[PDB]
Design a protein around this motif. Sequence first.
Motif, PDB file in Angstrom:
ATOM      1  N   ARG A 231      35.791  42.564  15.131  1.00  0.00           N
ATOM      2  CA  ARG A 231      35.600  42.163  16.527  1.00  0.00           C
ATOM      3  C   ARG A 231      34.557  41.046  16.658  1.00  0.00           C
ATOM      4  NH1 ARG A 231      35.634  40.200  20.614  1.00  0.00           N
ATOM      5  NH2 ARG A 231      35.930  41.068  22.715  1.00  0.00           N
ATOM      6  N   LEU A 232      33.413  41.248  16.012  1.00  0.00           N
ATOM      7  CA  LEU A 232      32.349  40.252  16.010  1.00  0.00           C
ATOM      8  C   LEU A 232      32.834  38.950  15.382  1.00  0.00           C
ATOM      9  CD1 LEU A 232      29.570  42.711  14.882  1.00  0.00           C
ATOM     10  CD2 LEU A 232      29.643  41.576  17.112  1.00  0.00           C
ATOM     11  N   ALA A 233      33.623  39.063  14.318  1.00  0.00           N
ATOM     12  CA  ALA A 233      34.221  37.886  13.696  1.00  0.00           C
ATOM     13  C   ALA A 233      35.070  37.125  14.708  1.00  0.00           C
ATOM     14  CB  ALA A 233      35.060  38.281  12.488  1.00  0.00           C
ATOM     15  N   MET A 234      35.880  37.852  15.473  1.00  0.00           N
ATOM     16  CA  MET A 234      36.674  37.221  16.528  1.00  0.00           C
ATOM     17  C   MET A 234      35.794  36.540  17.584  1.00  0.00           C
ATOM     18  SD  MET A 234      40.072  39.480  17.184  1.00  0.00           S
ATOM     19  CE  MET A 234      39.259  40.934  17.839  1.00  0.00           C
ATOM     20  N   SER A 235      34.750  37.234  18.034  1.00  0.00           N
ATOM     21  CA  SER A 235      33.801  36.615  18.963  1.00  0.00           C
ATOM     22  C   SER A 235      33.243  35.311  18.397  1.00  0.00           C
ATOM     23  CB  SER A 235      32.650  37.568  19.287  1.00  0.00           C
ATOM     24  OG  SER A 235      33.070  38.599  20.162  1.00  0.00           O
ATOM     25  N   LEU A 236      32.776  35.372  17.154  1.00  0.00           N
ATOM     26  CA  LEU A 236      32.198  34.209  16.498  1.00  0.00           C
ATOM     27  C   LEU A 236      33.236  33.100  16.359  1.00  0.00           C
ATOM     28  CD1 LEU A 236      29.621  33.099  15.195  1.00  0.00           C
ATOM     29  CD2 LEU A 236      30.398  34.076  13.026  1.00  0.00           C
ATOM     30  N   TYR A 237      34.480  33.482  16.085  1.00  0.00           N
ATOM     31  CA  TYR A 237      35.573  32.519  16.018  1.00  0.00           C
ATOM     32  C   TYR A 237      35.762  31.827  17.362  1.00  0.00           C
ATOM     33  CZ  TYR A 237      40.337  30.678  15.911  1.00  0.00           C
ATOM     34  OH  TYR A 237      41.448  29.869  16.006  1.00  0.00           O
TER      35      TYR A 237
END
Length: 301
Positions: A231-237
Amino acid sequence: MKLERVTVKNFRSHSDTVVEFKEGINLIIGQNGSGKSSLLDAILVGLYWPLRIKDIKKDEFTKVGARDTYIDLIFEKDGTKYRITRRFLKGYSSGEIHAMKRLVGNEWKHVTEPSSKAISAFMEKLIPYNIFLNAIYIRQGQIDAILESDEAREKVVREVLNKALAREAALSKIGELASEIFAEFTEGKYSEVVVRAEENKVRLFVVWEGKERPLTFLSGGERIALGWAFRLAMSLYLAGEISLLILDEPTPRKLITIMERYLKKIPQVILVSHDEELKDAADHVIRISLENGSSKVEVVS
């Protein structure tokens, strides 16, 4: 972006709620039905009116009761302190008044025309809608859905991000970022998460001894850690960087470590929960409770 102060009057159980936010992890704590998630909703609508937040209808702001509905958000972004004020009047002579000002010295001045459209246009430039509602705002259920199944995971990705050419690249990048974060979460036990795209199915693997392994290969904490990493990876993306996280209530121990290790490195985090155990992991504690049919705030830290 850094939230400073939120004032909500006559919205749901919030008759007169004032909350002061600060740097680091801000924990909003209280029993079920205290009105925490609704305060978050109030912040979101306060920022992005008249755009659709979740399934919230404008009627909740424009057509409930006789007393004015009042949303006042003060926040900072790139050195400038902004203040959004939305006032909904009721009764025979009903209407709406919207303003967005910035602080010049010690006085507030309009950044644009005091109207919904103009303020919306400005906010679109300041922080695009999809960014906040997907990169900054972590809605409850998304982690579970990520960890639920491939189809659910696909659903979450589709929800958060939005032609498979971009889908693949996106999932690849998110794969890289998720690898990097999950590598931190598990302290190097893993170093590579694989995000494979297929027909309405996103597969998520972890690498062990060179070979890939599915979700069940992991421990209870490793899975939630992986979900958060994803999820955090998606946010950062989406955002390219994480300055602010607003976390809706996570489902009810690894959360403590995730807070202690990762979230404390973020400039500001707004976390809602009924779990007392989190209080030690927060930098600032705001307690909210339901009394006489209205939410009541008290500052602890």
